[PDB]
């Protein structure tokens, strides 16, 4: 990954989280579970949705396009027509395939990026009240309850 998070310092995904693309695990004395960050997951959905819609919108509809006949003494005209049709077809096939290949790369990085900024955003909050273990986890020092875990999710906490 371009940003180091996905398939990076955070080895894998969680089949357990089904509310969004990015979220938290958390396991307090009250219990465990999973929670998705609407803020992130949503913004991600808005961008990608806009991307796919742009890609689709740029390829406005194809209107009637049919072959044409040429008599035996119009071989040059028939070949010119053939060059035109093959030429345009070559370019559009190329354009479609490149755009998708390229934007797919960008999309994955975008996600890697979002997971990254979500991680650092929490790390800047907690600060000293916990330590960075592994796989992007934070082991609390003061031990905070579920109601507290939520302060971290909504972006408050307060306790440098």
């Amino acid at each position: 990954g371009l940003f180091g998070a996905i398939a990076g310092f955070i080895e894998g995904g969680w089949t357990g989280m089904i509310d969004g693309w990015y979220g938290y695990h958390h396991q307090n004395e009250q219990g465990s579970g999973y929670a998705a960050d609407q803020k992130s997951t949503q913004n991600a959905i808005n961008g990608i949705t806009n991307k796919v819609n742009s890609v689709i919108e740029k390829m406005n509809i194809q209107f009637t396009a049919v072959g044409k006949e040429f008599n035996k003494l119009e071989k040059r005209m028939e070949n010119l027509n053939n060059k035109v049709d093959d030429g345009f077809l070559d370019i559009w096939t190329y354009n479609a395939e490149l755009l998708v290949l390229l934007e797919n790369e960008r999309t994955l990085d975008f996600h890697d990026s979002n997971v990254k900024n979500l991680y650092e955003k929490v790390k800047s909050q907690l600060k000293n009240n916990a330590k960075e273990i592994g796989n992007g986890c934070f082991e609390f020092y003061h031990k905070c309850d579920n109601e507290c875990m939520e302060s971290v999710r909504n972006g408050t906490y307060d306790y440098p």
Binding site: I6, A7, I10, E11, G12, G13, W14, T15, M17, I18, W21, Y22, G23, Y24, H25, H26, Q27, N28, E29, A36, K51, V52, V55, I56, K58, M59, I61, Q62, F63, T64, A65, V66, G67, E69, D85, L89, T93, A96, E97, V100, L101, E103, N104, E105, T107, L108, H111, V115, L118, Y119, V122, I133, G136, C137, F138, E139, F140, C144, M149, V152
Partner: protein, 323 residues
Amino acid sequence: DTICIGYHANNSTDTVDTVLEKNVTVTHSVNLLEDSHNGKLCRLKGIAPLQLGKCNIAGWLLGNPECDPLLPVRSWSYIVETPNSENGICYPGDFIDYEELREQLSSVSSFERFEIFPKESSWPNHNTNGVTAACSHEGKSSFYRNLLWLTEKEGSYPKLKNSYVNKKGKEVLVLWGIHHPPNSKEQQNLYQNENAYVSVVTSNYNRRFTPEIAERPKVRDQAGRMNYYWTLLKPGDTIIFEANGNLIAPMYAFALRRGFGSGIITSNASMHECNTKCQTPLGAINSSLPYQNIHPVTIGECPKYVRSAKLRMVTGLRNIPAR
């Protein structure tokens, strides 16, 4: 007490390609390439196509006896020819500017077939029963339904002159022929005048035709030849036919109505009571995707044809179930 930051994963097997890595498994994605059609010919927004079947444009417009079932059709959304559209002209010869005529019919949404020159009252001093085995019907010699083979009457072929004023309020496609006997003897038995000519004129059309008599190889066992011509007569204008022989006169003509989006396709698929906004020679497409790899020939509003086998845009992220 701990809290971790992580990302979604699932059982999805969707794969996509990227510039750095091929076949990357992801959680969500969308296909942008339409590869499905219904394998049928359909009505285009409620209107059925004109199926020429065993005939082709030429057979249809001239009135080849083998295409009588088409005579009543007045409107269509697109024209369909098949790999077996063999019946065109039946009497050997050349169809002048045939490809351009096909191009013209390509923007015609409908026409009215009418008698421009009624067989019974148009030619008082000429025979009109000319028939040929090359254009047989029901095992008997016949002729084009839209033309009339004029010949000598009682040993005489008076110089004819007939005209038609277009008062249809639309362009009138007029077709006719010129017969070319294989020898001077036939020229005489059929038209009497040894040196005949045909003249056809309008305000913007002007051509003269001279019989070219010579022995030729037999096609549909005819040594003779018949050349076919056509012109578009503008609303209000007049067309004048003058001849002293060899004229294969117009009997039925067509008042054309123009439209958009039509075209001529070739297909071996069958017509069904189905409706679509997008028709291909292989079948109809019902899709919102920007591309399709079904067929390059398209009638209506369709996705752009591309040669790609796959076009999938990743939406979710790299899928790592971590089992």
